[PDB]
Symmetry: C2
C-alpha cells in the first residue's frame, strides 16, 4: 500500500522514544508471511543490528542482535497476538533496560538492551507486509 | 523492479513443462532475504500446494507440500548456488517423477512428485525479491 517496503528511515533513539508502525500482512497466516523490524547502527543494510524483531505470522517470533557481523543469542516467543488477515498496530518503546513491543495496544514482547539504544542510526521494516504508517518520537531531549 | 511481487499466474503443468524465473534478492545475504515459489491447486492463496520451494539466501532451502491445509514432510538442502547481491535465473522443470530446479544453469535441487503436476492451477512467486521474468512453457500437448 502506501509506504515503500523495504522501508528505511534514519533514526535516533533514547529512553522514552517510541517507534510506531501500522501495516498488514501480504498473505494469509496459512502461508506464513514474515515481518521484520531491525534497529541498525548505520544507514547501510549490512551494518550491525542492536535489535532484530522477526515475526512468522501465526507461528513464532524470534529476536536477536547482530554484532560485528555475527548473530548473537537468539530468543524465541510463541506469543501471537497478531490476527489473521487483519491490519496491526505495532509500538516499540525504548525503556531504560529493554525494548517493549506492544501489538494492538497489548504488551507482547520485551528484549533487554545488549547495546545502548543511542547506537541506533537507522530502522528498517521489511518482508511480507504493506505499511501505511511509520513514526519515531523526537519530543524528549 | 518490473513485475509485481507477490506474483501470481494461472498455470497448467505436465511432463515437459518448464517454469523460468529471473529476479534479484532485495537484501544482502547477511540479512537472510527469502524467496518462495509455490505451485497451487487453485487460484486462491490458501489452496493446497503441490510443491513449495523456499530459499533462505545464504543459509538453506526447504521444500514441502501442503495437503488439505496441512504441511507434509519437509525436506531440507544446504546447497546454495545463489550468489550474494546477484541476479539469478531459476528454472523448474517438470520431469516424469520429480521437479528439477536449475539455478543459473546448474542442477541444484529435486523434489519427487507427491501429487500429479496436472493438479496445479496457479504459481505464486513471493517474499524478498524483485522479479523481471516469469514464463511457463505451453508447447507440448
Amino acid at each position: 500500500s502506501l509506504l515503500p517496503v523495504p522501508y528505511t528511515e534514519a533514526a535516533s533513539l533514547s529512553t522514552g522514544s517510541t517507534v510506531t508502525i501500522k501495516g498488514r500482512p501480504l498473505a494469509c497466516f496459512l502461508n506464513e508471511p514474515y515481518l521484520q523490524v531491525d534497529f541498525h547502527t548505520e544507514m547501510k543494510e549490512e551494518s550491525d543490528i542492536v535489535f532484530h524483531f522477526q515475526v512468522c505470522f501465526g507461528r513464532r517470533v524470534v529476536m536477536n542482535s547482530r554484532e560485528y557481523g555475527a548473530w548473537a543469542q537468539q530468543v524465541e516467543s510463541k506469543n501471537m497476538p497478531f490476527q489473521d488477515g487483519q491490519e496491526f498496530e505495532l509500538s516499540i518503546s525504548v525503556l531504560p533496560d529493554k525494548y517493549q513491543v506492544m501489538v494492538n495496544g497489548q504488551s507482547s514482547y520485551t528484549f533487554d538492551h545488549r547495546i545502548k539504544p543511542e547506537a541506533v542510526k537507522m530502522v528498517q521494516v521489511w518482508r511480507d507486509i504493506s505499511l501505511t504508517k511509520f513514526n519515531v518520537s523526537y519530543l524528549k531531549r
